[PDB]
């Protein structure tokens, strides 16, 4: 039943959904599969953990929001570390199954857009790649039309008297967080005493070790492509390596990072 | 299924995979899911682990060296992340864990089919655990294979023998199924190896390989016992976890460490 | 002395730091630097380890508890580094030790005045390690002050006791050169603060800290064990060693797991 | 005297040579200083392995080259890992004691730049932020002006006969390398028959590995400095952050990375 070891974790089930396709069949095309099906598991795990965090801002639960935090950190750490793994594959023995992918790539991942859209990267135009489907299209659209985990820390502080802009009250989620100078001054408040403003400097710390794990996941992401594809076109149609090192152009929480700047000026 | 096109999803046959995970508690803890997936992710992992010590095993049996070093070092990588994810485990603390055990069955890991083949495979056989995967026969033939066969161990040893190497000739035939059992007179066949790693070089590698996996599978089951530990606190339970630690693959790589010494360089050292 | 300007190398006093590397070994040995450095790069993490720590204690002594918690995640990440190098260490193998180690003292790091400071702030105090440090009075001296000086640990109590917890009367002074005994009284001051963390967020907190601190520093025992095994093989020796994975720091902190249970949470749960 | 444990470490002088320069005494600074001087102290030895390294490439002593190269990418990951340390300080700490270091900066690392040097990345003018040393100026100028270890690797395929261009045997090894195209053809060999070249290409890969793990650490170096200066321009005159993230393109094996575009084409 669910009470077994095999039964609670539903064994059968997971150990039954890998199944490589070349033929005959390579000696790392598992690697490959379980390098990614682990992955999508912890990526769940975030997503569940990170969904939290965001209830717990709502509710001004500081601690318990700092909690989940840390352990979505742990996640995030997991998930960059195993890019050692794979990088015990070799080109040699990638391009004896790379065919058998298609057009397949991880633009293709649900899960990675969901927790892109949690963090406040939005992009409207990645729906359509889940158009064959619609159930997990509907998912992705409701992040989408939500506020961002950032966001909701910026609501948090004008909670408490921050001076927040009236927009982030209500405002068109979809769009993606765009640069806020008028924030500036909140956080440089904020980091000038620390003491009195723990609680939000504690949480402004958090949020900058997610971001830098998570830029650390890109980093190592695109060096493990380089090294595996070197400059190949991607067969998500992209420039592959080129695509990947702009991603890491990409910021979560600007105003965060700016405000190290001004910091005692 | 994107216009018949193979996509991410149906490769890695995510609808299976990401609809395994069924926490119990009822209403639903929000600690269960990590409790499932911590088990999940460790699963997937041993699955690759088997996979590549079976390769291993084959490269030594072919006298193909460098291939089994290769494997060897993506075995290190997993076992590593075995090792390393118990880190996210240790956010699970006694208040949350005390919120969903009781809804939870009374068996562990021990249960784990993957888990045992792992621990045949690298010599520690053990024909009663046979038994406990009695439900199923399918799983329990499978393991049986390993059981009957020489481990990555006793292969290494056969793949001495075949160089000249001074190994007793009980391993060229014996009962495999009875865990490898401390030889002393391997001794004077590392200690060679180890005074003349210029001619011994493959050897000496394989050794240290081999050194390095049962040093970071010690590692893993130290991580395990101190996270089990702080989870629900301290034969069986934490007891058991702690006697495993006493346990050895490749007893005569470490045992040698205490008689290498002949000096055999060649002038100015 | 870069135009009377402060230099990288002047700042960080590196003329100095960098000319500490004397090998013993002649003709030289490759592998005798490896062995220094792994000894000093942990010495100059065990003084900042005990530069947080005593920081920590000034905070709980100020009843500053996010300051607390911030030093002890930069001990926790120290620590993890301290455990880490290890992975260096153990690419050093019997054939290149033996080449070096007849040039070396018969002494270990339990001859570290730092790390000796290390385990007095955390708790486990032995005044007859003082003897050891007979040949230098002035660091036996400032081994004494933290030796007579309550440990992180008591002064966690202290902070407890301060807020009402059921903390016994004798934290309040005593002896505390002697080494903290088990004392079962304290079982039910944990069990309340982990059975309603959300008035005891901070006691919540300080304690799953004290058990990060305390269990990345068993793991540190073990690597450092599982390292001396592979190099020279297996109280005194490896069995010492092997001894002080027996040792615990804060015993309530763990033994609480196994009586945790009151469900004090509102409707709903 | 040498056989005790603080004598044979000279712990005396490795203990002392922490000096704080704040005033009063700023509690992140012992921080901020062991954390350099432990990553100095890896440095060391990384060069220590990495010269043993070249000695063995040059006597066509593989598994003895190998043996060194793990090593290096243990000491590249030590330094790769630590700033997780150093990314517990904030902005609100450092700018506490960050006047006391003046115009100072990693510029001035002569074991830094020695490595650079030694994995090929050469650039005389370097010599001359250490005009104030010149015996160090000296030792940097000997590496400077010999083979770099990829150089070396590359004349080692060469006395075994793969198609080495006659360059490589003597020229100004004073200039950095440049991508050399002509060689795309001799990995590409190595890489399309493993078996029979598993010695040149457990070599590459090693390349690959050192590389990409220094890499690494130029990543995370350039994440920590955008969490605790942001984009201030550093100390040493650059922009900070954009100077750092311009280091992320420089490439020590070029033509180990641009084979992967060919491999299996
Ligand atoms: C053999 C190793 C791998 C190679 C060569 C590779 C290659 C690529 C390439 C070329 C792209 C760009 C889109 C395209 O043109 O295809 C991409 C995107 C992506 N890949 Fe990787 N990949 C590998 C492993 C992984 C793994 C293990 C994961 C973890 C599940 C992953 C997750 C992703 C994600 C989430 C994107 C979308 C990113 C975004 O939209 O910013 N890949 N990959
Ligand atoms: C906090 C959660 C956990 C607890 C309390 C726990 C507890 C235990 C205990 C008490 C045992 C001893 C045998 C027994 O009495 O059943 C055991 C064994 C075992 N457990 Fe863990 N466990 C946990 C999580 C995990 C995870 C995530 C894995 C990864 C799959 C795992 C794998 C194993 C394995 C493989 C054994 C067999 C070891 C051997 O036979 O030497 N456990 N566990
Ligand atoms: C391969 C090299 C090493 C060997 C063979 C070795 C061996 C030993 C042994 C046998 C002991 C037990 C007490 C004794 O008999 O002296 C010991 C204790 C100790 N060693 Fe290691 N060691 C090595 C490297 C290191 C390093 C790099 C450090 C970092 C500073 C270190 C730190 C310590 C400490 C702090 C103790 C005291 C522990 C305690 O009192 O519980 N050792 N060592
Ligand atoms: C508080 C943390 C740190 C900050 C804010 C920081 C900042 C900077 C900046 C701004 C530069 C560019 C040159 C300049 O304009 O100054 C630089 C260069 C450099 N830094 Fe860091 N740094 C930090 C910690 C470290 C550490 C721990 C190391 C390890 C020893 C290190 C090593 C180097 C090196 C080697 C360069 C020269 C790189 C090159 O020429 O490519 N830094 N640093
Ligand atoms: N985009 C990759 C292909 C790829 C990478 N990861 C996955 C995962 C998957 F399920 C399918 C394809 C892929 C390439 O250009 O080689
Ligand atoms: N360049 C840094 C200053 C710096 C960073 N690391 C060191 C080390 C050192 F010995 C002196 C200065 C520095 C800044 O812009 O803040
Ligand atoms: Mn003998
Ligand atoms: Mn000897
Ligand atoms: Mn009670
Ligand atoms: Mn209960």
């Given at each position: 039943g669910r009470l077994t070891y095999g039964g609670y974790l539903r064994l059968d089930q997971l150990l039954s959904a890998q199944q490589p396709l070349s033929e005959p069949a390579h000696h790392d095309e598992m690697l490959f599969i379980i390098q990614h099906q682990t992955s999508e598991l912890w990526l769940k795990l975030l997503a569940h953990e990170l969904r939290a965090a965001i209830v717990h801002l709502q509710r001004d639960e500081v601690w318990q929001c700092r909690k989940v935090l840390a352990r979505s950190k742990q996640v995030l750490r997991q998930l960059?570390?195993?890019?050692?793994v794979l990088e015990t594959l070799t080109p040699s023995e990638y391009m004896g199954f790379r065919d058998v992918l298609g057009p397949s790539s991880g633009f293709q991942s649900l899960q990675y857009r969901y927790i892109?859209?949690?963090?406040?990267?939005?992009?409207?135009?990645?729906?359509?790649?889940?158009?064959?489907?619609?159930?997990?299209?509907?998912?992705?659209?409701?992040?989408?039309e939500a506020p961002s985990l950032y966001e909701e820390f910026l609501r948090y502080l004008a909670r408490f008297?921050?001076?927040?802009?009236?927009?982030?009250?209500?405002?068109?989620?979809?769009?993606?967080?765009?640069?806020?100078?008028?924030?500036?001054?909140?956080?440089?408040?904020?980091?000038?005493?620390?003491?009195?403003?723990?609680?939000?400097?504690?949480?402004?710390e958090d949020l900058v070790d997610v971001e830098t794990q998570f830029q650390l996941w890109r980093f190592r992401h695109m060096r493990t492509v380089m090294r595996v594809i070197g400059f190949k076109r991607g067969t998500g149609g992209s420039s592959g390596v080129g695509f990947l090192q702009q991603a890491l152009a990409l910021t979560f929480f600007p105003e965060l990072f700016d405000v190290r700047t001004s910091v005692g000026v």
């Open positions: 960059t570390e195993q890019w050692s892109e859209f949690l963090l406040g990267n939005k992009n409207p135009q990645m729906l359509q790649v889940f158009a064959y489907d619609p159930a997990g299209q509907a998912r992705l659209r409701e992040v989408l008297g921050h001076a927040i802009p009236q927009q982030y009250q209500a405002r068109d989620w979809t769009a993606a967080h765009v640069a806020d100078d008028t924030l500036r001054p909140v956080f440089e408040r904020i980091y000038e005493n620390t003491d009195r403003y723990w609680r939000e400097y504690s949480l402004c």
